[PDB]
């Protein structure tokens, strides 16, 4: 509904260190939206990013939620938000499960 | 994807099989002599390419793929290595195991 699915803005939003995606493609031509894309957003440790992969377990992706899915992520730490050592818990997930 | 007319990361960027094709595709499970516990990363496939491949063409290169619009060199926000390694292991399900 007035969605379009223009993904060039997400790509341009911030640089990536690596794509760290499990489904890289042009992702349509940004004129038309197809399928319900959805966005399950959370923040995890650099080793946990690799742990959440198709068919992978580790500690994460067994606790919380398992990943058939597209992993395209803007792989950039929001240093302006995570600059404090005490931080916040705005991105929490049930890592204990 | 190893069939006439298929689409996917292999059919399009690693090996296009002809649509008018005569021959046999023989496949078997190979967890033995592969899929070491520490991860067998000797096998690579291409995931990023400029265009789709023609039947039986083998373009073997390490040219860095430019995903974005701004030029870059080697490694950077728009520069990605074109090949993706895959670590085969005994713990992966059937769809994620190596086949010979």
């Amino acid at each position: 509904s007035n969605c379009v699915a223009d993904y060039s803005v997400l790509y341009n939003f911030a640089p990536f260190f690596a794509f760290k995606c499990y489904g890289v493609s042009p992702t349509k031509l940004n004129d038309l939206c197809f399928t319900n894309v959805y966005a399950d957003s959370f923040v995890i440790k650099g080793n946990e990013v690799s742990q959440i992969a198709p068919g992978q377990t580790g500690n994460i992706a067994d606790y919380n939620y398992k990943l058939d899915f597209t992993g395209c992520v803007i792989a950039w730490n929001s240093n302006k938000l995570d600059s404090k050592h005490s931080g916040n818990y705005d991105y929490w997930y049930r890592s204990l499960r | 994807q190893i069939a006439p007319g298929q689409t996917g990361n292999i059919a399009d960027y690693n090996y296009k099989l002809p649509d008018d094709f005569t021959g046999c595709v023989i496949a078997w499970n190979s967890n033995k002599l592969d899929s070491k516990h520490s991860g067998n990363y000797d096998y690579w496939y291409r995931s990023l390419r400029k265009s789709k491949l023609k039947p039986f063409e083998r373009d073997i290169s390490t040219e860095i793929y430019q995903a974005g619009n701004k030029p870059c060199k080697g490694k950077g926000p728009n520069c990605y290595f074109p090949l993706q390694s895959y670590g085969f292991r005994p713990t992966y399900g059937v769809g994620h195991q190596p086949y010979r």
Binding site: - | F56, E57, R58, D59
Partner: protein, 35 residues
Amino acid sequence: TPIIGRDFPQGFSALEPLVDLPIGINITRFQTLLA
């Protein structure tokens, strides 16, 4: 093709296949080699 030493007769002839070399590469340019 045996031809007269200089002038072309502009006659008709045809070539026969000799080899299929499946190099499997993209060919866009070529050059000759001097001995």
